[PDB]
Short mmCIF file of C-alpha atoms in Angstrom, two decimals:
data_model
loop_
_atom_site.label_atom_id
_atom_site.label_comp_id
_atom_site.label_asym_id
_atom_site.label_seq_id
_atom_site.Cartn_x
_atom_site.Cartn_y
_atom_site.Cartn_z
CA UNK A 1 0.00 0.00 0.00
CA UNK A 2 3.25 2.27 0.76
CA UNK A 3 4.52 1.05 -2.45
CA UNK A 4 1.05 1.96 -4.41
CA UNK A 5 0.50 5.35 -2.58
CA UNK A 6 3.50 6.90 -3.58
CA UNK A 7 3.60 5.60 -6.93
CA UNK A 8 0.31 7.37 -7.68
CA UNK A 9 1.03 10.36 -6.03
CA UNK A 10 2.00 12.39 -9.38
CA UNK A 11 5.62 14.66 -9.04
CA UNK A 12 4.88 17.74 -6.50
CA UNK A 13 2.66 15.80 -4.46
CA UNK A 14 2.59 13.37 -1.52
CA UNK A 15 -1.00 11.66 -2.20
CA UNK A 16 -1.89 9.14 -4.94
CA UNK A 17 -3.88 11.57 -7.55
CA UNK A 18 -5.60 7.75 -8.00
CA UNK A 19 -6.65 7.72 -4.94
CA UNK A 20 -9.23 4.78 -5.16
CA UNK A 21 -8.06 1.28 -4.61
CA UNK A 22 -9.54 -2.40 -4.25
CA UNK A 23 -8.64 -4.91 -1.60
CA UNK A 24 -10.04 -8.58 -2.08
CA UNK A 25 -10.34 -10.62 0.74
CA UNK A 26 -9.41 -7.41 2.55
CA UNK A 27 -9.78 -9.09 6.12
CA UNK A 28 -9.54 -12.69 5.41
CA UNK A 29 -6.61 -13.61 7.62
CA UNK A 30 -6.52 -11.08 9.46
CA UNK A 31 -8.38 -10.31 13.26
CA UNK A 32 -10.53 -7.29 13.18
CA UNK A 33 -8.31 -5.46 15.70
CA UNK A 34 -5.34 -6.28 13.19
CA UNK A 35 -7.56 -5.43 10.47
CA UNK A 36 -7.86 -1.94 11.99
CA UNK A 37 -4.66 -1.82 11.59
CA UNK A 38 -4.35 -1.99 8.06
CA UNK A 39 -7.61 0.17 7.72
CA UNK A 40 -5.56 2.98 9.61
CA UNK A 41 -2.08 2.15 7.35
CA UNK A 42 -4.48 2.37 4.14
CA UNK A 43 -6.33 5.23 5.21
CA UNK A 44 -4.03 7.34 6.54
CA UNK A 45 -1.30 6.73 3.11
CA UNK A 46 -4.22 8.80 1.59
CA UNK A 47 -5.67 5.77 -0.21
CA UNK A 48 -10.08 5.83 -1.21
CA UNK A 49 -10.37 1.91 -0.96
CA UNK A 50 -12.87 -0.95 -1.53
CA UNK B 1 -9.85 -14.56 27.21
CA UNK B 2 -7.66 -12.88 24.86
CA UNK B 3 -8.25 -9.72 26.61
CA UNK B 4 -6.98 -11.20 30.10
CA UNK B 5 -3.82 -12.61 28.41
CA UNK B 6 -3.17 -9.46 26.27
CA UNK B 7 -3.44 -6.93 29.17
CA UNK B 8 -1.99 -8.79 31.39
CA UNK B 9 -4.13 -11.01 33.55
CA UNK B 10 -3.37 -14.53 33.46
CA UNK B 11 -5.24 -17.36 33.00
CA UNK B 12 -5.24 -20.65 34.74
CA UNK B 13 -6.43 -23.69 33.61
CA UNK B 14 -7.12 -27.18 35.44
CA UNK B 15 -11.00 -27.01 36.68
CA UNK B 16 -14.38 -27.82 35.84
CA UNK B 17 -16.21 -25.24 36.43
CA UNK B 18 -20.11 -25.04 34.98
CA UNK B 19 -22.08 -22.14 33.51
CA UNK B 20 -25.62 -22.22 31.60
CA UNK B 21 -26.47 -19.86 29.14
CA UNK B 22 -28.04 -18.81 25.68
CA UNK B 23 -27.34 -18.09 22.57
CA UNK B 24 -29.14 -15.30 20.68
CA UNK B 25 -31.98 -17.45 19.31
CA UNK B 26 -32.90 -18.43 22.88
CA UNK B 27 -31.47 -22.04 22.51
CA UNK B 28 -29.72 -23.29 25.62
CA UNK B 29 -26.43 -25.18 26.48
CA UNK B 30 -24.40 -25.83 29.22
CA UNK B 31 -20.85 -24.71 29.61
CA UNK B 32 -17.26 -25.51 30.85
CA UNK B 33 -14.88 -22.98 31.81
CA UNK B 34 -11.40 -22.60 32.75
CA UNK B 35 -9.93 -20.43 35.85
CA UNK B 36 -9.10 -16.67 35.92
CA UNK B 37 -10.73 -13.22 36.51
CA UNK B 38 -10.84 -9.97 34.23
CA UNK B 39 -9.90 -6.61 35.96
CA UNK B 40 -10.59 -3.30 34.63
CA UNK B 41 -7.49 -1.47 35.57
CA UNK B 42 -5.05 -4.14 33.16
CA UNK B 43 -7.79 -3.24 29.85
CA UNK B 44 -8.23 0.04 30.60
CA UNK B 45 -4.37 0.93 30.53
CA UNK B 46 -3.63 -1.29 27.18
CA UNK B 47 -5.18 0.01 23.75
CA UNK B 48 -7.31 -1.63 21.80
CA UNK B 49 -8.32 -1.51 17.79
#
């Protein structure tokens, strides 16, 4: 998601001008306390998602 | 359980101890449970998410 969000984020700018993304079995191995975690990481590198 | 182990408060285990309760269609059981106690000060200082 690191990777992603700076790649998208267009010269001059921190924030992936795509901002939308798609996640998959977003949560599937994950416990919803850890999932939170991700949701934060996502959310917080700037990143729409679905 | 998790809570008591993340926290802090241990758990013990070697005991039958009995419980009977319901589950959210009104269905009954019976339960077995191991031995410890949950304490508000050990949750309330770790975070959650």
């Amino acid at each position: 998601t690191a990777s992603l969000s700076y790649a998208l984020s267009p010269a001059g700018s921190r924030y992936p001008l795509f901002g939308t993304i798609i996640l998959d079995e977003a949560f599937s191995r994950s416990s919803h306390a850890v999932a939170g975690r991700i949701i934060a990481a996502l959310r917080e590198f700037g990143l729409h998602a679905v | 359980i998790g809570m008591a182990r993340e926290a802090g408060i241990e758990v013990i285990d070697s005991q039958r101890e009995f419980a009977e309760l319901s589950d959210g269609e009104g269905r009954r059981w019976r339960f077995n449970l191991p031995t410890t106690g949950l304490e508000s000060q050990a949750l309330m200082d770790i975070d959650w998410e």
